[PDB]
Amino acid sequence: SRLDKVEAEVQIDRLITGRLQSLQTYVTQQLIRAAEIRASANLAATKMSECVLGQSKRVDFCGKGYHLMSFPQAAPHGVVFLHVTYVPSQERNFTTAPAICHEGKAYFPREGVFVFNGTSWFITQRNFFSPQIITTDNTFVSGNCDVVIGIINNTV
Amino acid sequence: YICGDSTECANLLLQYGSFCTQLNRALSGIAAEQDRNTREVFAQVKQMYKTPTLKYFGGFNFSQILPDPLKPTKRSFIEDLLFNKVTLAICAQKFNGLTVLPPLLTDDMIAAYTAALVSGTATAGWTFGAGAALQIPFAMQMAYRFNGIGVTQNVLYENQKQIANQFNKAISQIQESLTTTSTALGKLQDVVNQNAQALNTLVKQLSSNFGAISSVLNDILSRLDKVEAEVQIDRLITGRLQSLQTYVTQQLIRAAEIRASANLAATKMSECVLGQSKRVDFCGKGYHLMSFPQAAPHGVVFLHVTYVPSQERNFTT
Amino acid sequence: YICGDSTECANLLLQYGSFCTQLNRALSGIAAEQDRNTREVFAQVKQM
Amino acid sequence: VKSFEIDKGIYQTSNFRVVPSGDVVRFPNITNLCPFGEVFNATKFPSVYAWERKKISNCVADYSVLYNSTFFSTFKCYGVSATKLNDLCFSNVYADSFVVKGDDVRQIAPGQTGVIADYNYKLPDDFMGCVLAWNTRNIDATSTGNYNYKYRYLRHGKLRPFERDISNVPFSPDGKPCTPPALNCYWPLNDYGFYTTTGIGYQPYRVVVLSFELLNAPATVCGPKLSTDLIKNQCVNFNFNGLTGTGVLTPSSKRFQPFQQFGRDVSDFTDSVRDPKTSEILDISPCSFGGVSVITPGTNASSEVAVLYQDVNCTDVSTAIHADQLTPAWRIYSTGNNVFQTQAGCLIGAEHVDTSYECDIPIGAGICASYIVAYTMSLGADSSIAYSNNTIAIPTNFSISITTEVMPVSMAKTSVDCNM
């Protein structure tokens, strides 16, 4: 209404410069948010290719337990995973020996630790309690009885 | 920073809209994200254990790895060496406007986290994390750790003293190679130096002019009358505003790189510490038998106990 | 780039602080970190 | 945050700063009247090639005799402003007097050489004070002729600023000591031709240049102001000899120099000054400032807030509240207690509690609030384990615990019509 000349062109230069810095700022910060969101999306594609398509043995990546399965679901703009974990908890107390000195020779069990020397009875798994009757398949010939800490006889 | 105080320079600031709200929001979001980084890296054990106060198991000197009650500080000795190594190039009160707020998760709590992680690594069995513990006497632990490596259990027990001696001498060599050594602790000082460069450059941009008469306010205030006043003050506000906004953008980019490194760090403290991560040349550089955390100024310092075999022979197959 | 060379335009560039130094340091840091990119990709073998 | 329901958390908000209370001016005790009435109302005035530079010091100027008078034809200041001129005790001001024609007002400037300002009187390009000229057609200009004043127009080169040539050299463009009237060998001197009834451009003007040597000494030429006394450890305003500002004063720890006066500690930040009445005081110009932040439990279990100030020590805060000095000045506002450690500042409205919780709300350095209490922190469920021999725990019953996890993969696909 009240403008005349290059005066107003100076004023509109001020307006354009301010709005142009604001828009440039918007573009730059949305680009930074895009970088973070695509890093997260790469993690998400990695978890869908890993956790959902197979059992990913890496720990505290997919779930918080031991990651038995995974079920994806969509979202507004996102994705929501449902990690089917596996949490073991009823702790016990049983003694052990790292070896079996049957007849002067070492019997280490299976790579697959804890010889159950709970009164020298079995050899089990690591996580789930499962006693198995000890046989020659459950261990192997290993040297002599030099580094055996716990003597266990009657290897059947 | 922008326009220290006059009366009217604040009004000329309000003529440029609401940038101050944006900058406070952006820096507060950056600060909250760094606190989130520290929570995500360190706060991964709910069940904080206690130091077993033997610190020697079989032949395994955990001396200087865990903190000592007999020492005055509650940090371990290697952490103290690392704190001494990293330089820094009542309350603070400076009329920059600038400040460095303190971190939330304070340094002795960080050290308690590291001691808890090392303790539950050394104690508490292989099943650490998802569960509580298993009461495993740490020879059985690394007897088991010889099975994510493809060797049998014969290796540990038949060679216990030699493994323990190599382990202890390696830790003592780590001490000697962290005391009087050099730039192989560089990245943390790179972080601190870049922060110093950015902030000191920002202060120097306050010291500079931007085509105005003087490079400071309250000088041209003494010789202002009218619109000439607003000319020089608008020039100063525009220059300081571009400099400060450039600072904000570069802080945000450095925060992006630092959270990429933080995600790698949280990943490795999950993978390498809490179990034996069989992926190769990710945790260590050998076969990743163990890994320990240690705190740091602004970072994390691991110790990867690898496994490098070298006495080759010749055998036909 | 800014102010190719005249006489006094260089002085007006001096009137805007040390922006020239900041940009040179930023591009130098870009160069060094991408050298680090190439080293950490390819130079991973001790024994060629 | 533009809402009514507001959930639980520290929410950053506006800035607090202490309003200064007092008003402190410290000048020298020098009292005199300036020779302005001497120099401006004088008889003898030199020409341009012999312009005279007079020192004025140990005075009290007024700077209203310069304004409350229509004696002045052209009065233009360059480095300073007009009305705010007596707010600065200058250092050893210099009056440069000469007499020009009714044309040469356009020349005398930083730059804009012309002839006589290029040949007879040169200015620098920054250090200027105020230039004044007035018409004196009714004193010396006889219509018969005032042939007593001269200038020089023949110089081998231009001038450096504030430099004066007097010697009548027999100017010849190739060295050549000549005998004028030889060819190309003249005198550089030339008259004016000041007449009474001629045009305005041929009328005599008297020109006074006021160069202001800004504050390279303990200042002597002040203005008509009144000094008060020092108010230490309390936020006040400043006006020293040439410096204003707003801050908190305190005695120093300096090895200061007899010629020095300012402190400019790291990068134009004054921080220490030398009082004009024999003292040396530091300057914490940061009185107190920062940003407040509200702690709220969430407007659905409570309605009581707690204000966290950030960079303070809870000693200026109590005084500034209970004497109404804070810029977020409230109306309904009280203080039951004042928690302060973990140097993130004043925690107004909280209770120290040894029984620490799971760190609901992140206050500063360790300390976390709740509910309103503000404990330090329980980092986790504390325990110890039996670390004896062969006895080993093994889980026998397990569970399955499906856990969620959220990953954002796509922000808002936006676009800008950047012509609208």
Numbering used by the authors:
A (entry chain B): 964 to 1119
B (entry chain A): 723 to 811, 832 to 1059
C (entry chain C): 723 to 770
D (entry chain B): 290 to 660, 674 to 722
Article sentences:
The spike (S) glycoprotein of the coronavirus is a class I viral fusion protein located on the outer envelope of the virion that plays a critical role in viral infection by recognizing host cell receptors and mediating fusion of the viral and cellular membranes. The coronavirus S glycoprotein is synthesized as a precursor protein consisting of ~1,300 amino acids that is then cleaved into an amino (N)-terminal S1 subunit (~700 amino acids) and a carboxyl (C)-terminal S2 subunit (~600 amino acids). The S1 subunit contains a receptor-binding domain (RBD), while the S2 subunit contains a hydrophobic fusion peptide and two heptad repeat regions. Among these, CTD1 is the receptor-binding domain, and one CTD1 in the trimer adopts an “up” conformation as a prerequisite for the binding of SARS-CoV to the cellular receptor angiotensin-converting enzyme 2 (ACE2).
Our cryo-EM analysis of the SARS-CoV S glycoprotein and ACE2 complex sample captured three ACE2-bound and two ACE2-free conformational states of the trypsin-cleaved and low-pH-treated SARS-CoV S glycoprotein. The structure of one of the two ACE2-free states had one CTD1 in the “up” position and was determined at a resolution of 3.9 Å. This conformation was designated as the unbound-up conformation, which is ready for receptor binding and represents a receptor-binding active state. Structural comparisons of the CTD1s from different ACE2-free conformational states showed that the “up” angles of the CTD1s were between 50° and 70°, while the angle for the CTD1s in the “down” position was approximately 22.7°. The CTD2s of the unbound-up and ACE2-bound conformations exhibited a hinge motion away from the spike axis compared to CTD2 in the unbound-down conformation. These results indicate that the hinge linker between CTD1 and CTD2 underlies the flexibility of CTD1. Interestingly, only one of the three CTD1s in the S glycoprotein was observed in the “up” position in all analyzed structures. Here, our results showed that the prefusion architecture, either in the unbound or ACE2-bound state, was retained in the cleaved S glycoprotein, and the conformational heterogeneity of CTD1s still existed.
